Design an enzyme around this catalytic site. Structure first.
Site, PDB file in Angstrom:
ATOM      1  CB  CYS A 196      -0.934  -0.006   1.210  1.00 24.53           C
ATOM      2  SG  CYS A 196      -2.099  -1.386   1.266  1.00 24.53           S
ATOM      3  N   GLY A 223      24.099 -15.215  22.788  1.00 28.26           N
ATOM      4  CA  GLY A 223      23.820 -13.816  23.046  1.00 28.26           C
ATOM      5  C   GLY A 223      22.402 -13.542  23.500  1.00 28.26           C
ATOM      6  N   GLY A 228      17.189 -14.460  19.721  1.00 27.76           N
ATOM      7  CA  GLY A 228      16.601 -15.497  18.892  1.00 27.76           C
ATOM      8  C   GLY A 228      17.045 -15.442  17.444  1.00 27.76           C
ATOM      9  CB  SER A 229      16.685 -13.346  14.781  1.00 29.78           C
ATOM     10  OG  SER A 229      16.565 -11.997  15.199  1.00 29.78           O
ATOM     11  N   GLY A 230      19.984 -13.456  16.427  1.00 30.01           N
ATOM     12  CA  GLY A 230      21.289 -12.829  16.361  1.00 30.01           C
ATOM     13  C   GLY A 230      22.368 -13.754  15.838  1.00 30.01           C
ATOM     14  CE  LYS A 231      21.767 -17.591  19.526  1.00 29.58           C
ATOM     15  NZ  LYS A 231      21.248 -16.348  20.157  1.00 29.58           N
TER      16      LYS A 231
END
Lengths: 644, 637
Positions: free
Chosen positions: B13, B511, B514-517
């Site tokens: 949009c 660390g 959840g979505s760093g490594k």
């Protein structure tokens, strides 16, 4: 008679084979009962489930292995063979006749086919199930005519049907009357050079057409409204029955499997409305047109009859190969779409391993297969269209030729032949529609059976034969005694449990890397009933207590949180209908949820809908339930069974 | 002129609104090229992304006002307003003019629509973006005509098109010749009782009809083959380009956003074949038929021209409301299907809370909405059909009336009138087909633009510096130099990372993210590039190393395992199908997978509808990797 029962879904293949064998021996039953009776899960059924279900029918079933040599010998004639197609699936076939050179097998997905012995043994894995009608077998017919059941929806809508019938009759009469305009032009007005009569008669033949158009408009509006009403009725009935079905129905089937019957309701409506109206109108209209055609000339009417007979013969001959080609195209398209979906989902692995060249090669191969099937169906359509066009056009030329011959001989006039050519529409079109009604009726019969097999099932309340008794209080000590459970016909999950839970003292069962402990809680919610043993609250059995009270006084916070597209207020107040703002405020405050409310676009979060703001809503709803028993996956809370 | 650029997909949009503003000032650009700068992702873009993209495009814009009903104040005429109507995943509309309590906005999902000062205020949340061209703004037309691009597929197929054209010309000529059978029958044979010539002439016309049927058969076969070829070519080109696109294309899109492009390719084929052939054949056929009709009688030809003009006017008038009704029906059906899916998936919760009655009522309400939209479209179709039928039938009756008048006056003959009625098909029907080509052309132009936006996107290899063809060993120390990253106009997941993995060591990274490594693994695999840092192995920058070697020497084991169809032998050989079975069995025994393997029919099952982790790890070791990342240097998440 070599009965072959089609499989409605992609999973009920062994059930279809068992139903085919049962019907071969004079026992017809709904496919739903056999499907839930063979232990058909999402993955599919197996030999053990088919053997057990056959034993439930009085059959004598055995599980044996065989090879080419064993096929060369003599055994029971209509057996079940575990034939693997596409290198997977739980696919089964029914071997009917040995015929050593060629094996004739009924496949639920294709029909009665014939394979070479070597090819059959290449595709057959040796799994043989030998069915034989035992002493307890009883022939009978245990299925209902669902076409009548769905046509019963037309009983309240009788005035609309009558109005449509009358409008169709008037439309047909006006068209038949107006088809004589060319005759009046060429026989009376043009020949005798009448100019005033030409203007008066032509103006009177335009009013007839306007009345015809208005009648068509009104009839189309009525037909559209009737179809919408029938569709809504069928869909709502199916959904209302589905919502009450036991959890076995939902665990044994996918989501699309349950949803495609909403689309099948459209086919059922197409039959019940279009086929009925078309038969009722077109029979009379074709009879009148044929009478008038014979009135004009007998020879031309006979030629028209021959033309329509040839058209019907050609259409009937080409009916079934077109269906087979369409089915093959649908299968190829489904395979290609599945391959594309898996390729897109796992694009990371393809990129990492550098498999882009082979992925596009596989996709190209599947697209080539799809194009080949599309070309096959297109060539079938082209052949049918060419044959029907030859018949129609050559018959029209022959009719003009014979009409000119009759006019020359004096049996007709110049305008009578043109009037015959005009009435040819009102004769040939109704019979063409009556002939073309076959695929619609067949497809909608299939769809009606697909809906009615589910509509025949028994809901949760019906299965609970025992009543509520006088148990209103759910506070007590929970006792599981000798409780065994089985997910259909698979290996037992819970074996000989003797468990005691006190009144209030919080407990937590500890499992060993298994989900079975979770379904222990499902045995307290009456989602499933134990095969053996008993579940009691205090000194009263669970099956003794009403279902509604049991589900109202017990709250289960499943790790698979269900949040639907609605406001947070509506999401929290699910099935309550008696709440005040203070209660929701307190419940959200207790389960660390009222703080998150103020941190959002802040339309009191009533817009729509990390895995921390979904679960917490589930515990908030559970506390809103005010449950007598709380299970997580006041002292008088009958413990908090925590799945750890 | 108000430009109201439409909406290709669900989550664009804001991109569509920004494209509309850019086109208003004279800057046309590809929507997919704009959808990328705005930071659009699966959940849609925000105001900050629009402001950033507008700043990049050359505007001098400030936004996120969080204001109130201050529309009385004189702000910039074109702006972007956040709209929360019909729920959905975010929504922006472009305000063009604010006049006397009437608000004129264009909606990418619907079009240019006006509601009110009051109704719009009930949906407008106060977040306005003021869009103003700057000094660096430059006009242009950086897009291109994708219908010409897909027409080039007809260049390799020119013998087929010429054969189709010749067969169509012969078919039309034979039909026009055979239309005079009734004239010869009534004017000459019937009148003079020529019994012997009647048989011969009728046999000749039957032969002509049979030749016409044969030509139609041949033309149909050729047309089907041509359409299949074009469709397959477009599909394969689109898929081959899509497989080469970077990961930024796949994270920001959905799985079902590409199958839609496949059907778009089908529609492009439909246009490129049908519209071209129909124009080429029907223009000539209609011209010839009109000339012949004028030869027969001028007044009747004028009547036929009036009939076709009225039909064209009616269908052109009715074209757009039918499209709007179809769009509304599609939206309502999507809502109903989503509700059914949600209710079926969460049946356990509904049973637990006793919400079957409310679910049934809501489904009934959505079914009623779908039925209302269906009735609206059906009534539109019924009105159009009634008007068209009135025109056609009254035109036929008027043609017969005027022909009888002319025959009485002596200007023609009855056989001539019947021949005119016969040739009326070969005149009118080509023009009807030419007129009915508008919706097909519009739909397929939309589809062609939608597919060509993706086809114009740059591949992964295009956005890469020249590869240093000397480093064939990714074994040295892995050094992160001030690595920073963000997943697209969003919060930065990594800030000032300075580590150094020793050569030949199994290291572990933790660390609490959840979505760093996983992101560290992604940048190490060159799926994304650090925005303000560098990654080095053996003193060599990650950009200078060839991407092929980077993907070949570094193995990653992910939480989700891609096991698609092809057995176990072919699936473990996803990258390379080479090497013999001894290495495969050695590495399968190496990690975890030899015991629960032989219990299957020799690893062979070509559908593949704990063990997945074992298969993924084994496939990783079949690669003979230099850097192994688990979710020789070993990195453990």
């Amino acid at each position: 008679k070599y009965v072959c029962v089609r499989q409605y879904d992609l999973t009920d293949c062994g059930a279809a084979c068992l139903s085919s064998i049962a019907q071969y021996y004079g026992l017809k039953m709904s496919l739903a009962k056999i499907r839930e009776m063979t232990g058909t899960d999402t993955q599919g059924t197996n030999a053990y489930g088919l053997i057990h279900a056959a034993k439930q029918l009085g059959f004598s079933a055995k599980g044996v292995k065989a090879s080419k040599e064993d096929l060369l010998k003599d055994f029971r004639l209509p057996a079940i063979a575990n034939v693997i197609v596409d290198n997977r699936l739980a696919h089964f076939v029914v071997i009917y006749s040995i015929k050593n050179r060629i094996i004739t097998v009924a496949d639920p997905g294709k029909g009665i086919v014939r394979y070479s012995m070597d090819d059959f043994c290449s595709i057959w894995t040796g799994g043989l199930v030998l069915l034989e009608p035992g002493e307890a077998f009883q022939k009978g017919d245990y299925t209902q005519n669902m076409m009548v059941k769905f046509a019963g929806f037309l009983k309240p809508l009788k005035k609309t049907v009558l109005c449509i019938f009358l409008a169709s009759l008037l439309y047909t009469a006006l068209g038949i009357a107006g088809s004589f305009y060319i005759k009046f032009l060429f026989d009376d007005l043009i020949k005798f050079e009448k100019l005033n009569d030409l203007h008066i008669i032509s103006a009177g033949f335009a009013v007839i057409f306007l009345l015809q158009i208005f009648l068509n408009y009104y009839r189309s509006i009525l037909v559209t409204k009737l179809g919408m009403s029938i569709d809504k009725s069928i869909m709502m009935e199916y959904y209302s029955h589905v919502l009450k079905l036991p959890m076995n129905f939902f665990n044994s089937r996918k989501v699309g499997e349950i949803i495609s019957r909403f689309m099948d309701a459209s086919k059922i409506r197409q039959a019940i409305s279009g086929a009925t109206l078309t038969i009722m109108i077109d029979t009379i209209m074709a009879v009148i047109g044929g009478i008038l055609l014979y009135i004009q000339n007998s020879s031309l009417f006979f030629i028209s009859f021959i033309i329509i007979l040839l058209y019907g013969i050609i259409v009937t001959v080409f009916n079934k190969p077109i269906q087979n080609a369409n089915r093959q195209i649908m299968e190829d398209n489904a395979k290609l779409t599945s391959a594309l979906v898996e390729s897109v989902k796992g694009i990371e692995t393809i990129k990492s391993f550098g498999a882009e060249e082979q992925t596009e090669k596989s996709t190209r191969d599947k697209i080539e297969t799809v194009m080949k099937s599309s070309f096959k169906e297109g060539m079938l359509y082209i052949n049918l269209s060419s044959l029907t066009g030859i018949v129609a056009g050559l018959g029209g030329i022959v009719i003009l030729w014979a009409g000119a011959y009759n006019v020359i001989k004096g049996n007709m006039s110049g305008g009578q032949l043109l009037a015959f050519n005009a009435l040819l529409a009102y004769f040939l079109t109704p019979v063409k529609n009556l002939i073309d009604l076959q695929p619609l009726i067949q497809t909608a019969v299939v769809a009606s059976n697909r809906l009615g097999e589910i509509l025949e099932l028994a809901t949760e309340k019906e299965l609970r034969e025992d009543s509520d008794d006088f148990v209103i209080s759910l506070k007590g000590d929970i006792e599981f005694r000798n409780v065994d459970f089985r997910y259909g016909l698979r290996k037992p999950v819970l074996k000989n449990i003797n468990l005691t839970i006190p009144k209030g003292k919080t407990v937590a069962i500890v499992g060993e890397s298994g989900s079975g402990k979770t379904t222990l809680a499902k045995l307290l919610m009456n989602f499933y009933s134990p095969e053996k043993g008993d579940i009691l609250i205090n000194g009263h059995s669970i099956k003794n207590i009403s279902l509604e009270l049991i589900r109202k006084k017990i709250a289960f916070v499943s790790q698979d949180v269900f949040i639907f597209s609605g406001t947070v207020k509506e999401n929290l107040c699910l099935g309550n209908e008696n709440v005040d703002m203070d209660e929701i405020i307190k419940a959200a405050k207790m389960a660390n949820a009222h703080d998150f409310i103020e941190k959002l676009p802040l339309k009191y979060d009533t817009f729509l809908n990390s895995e921390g703001q979904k679960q917490r809503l589930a515990i908030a709803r559970a506390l809103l339930k005010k449950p007598d028993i709380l299970i997580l996956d006041l002292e008088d809370d009958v413990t908090v069974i925590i799945i750890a």
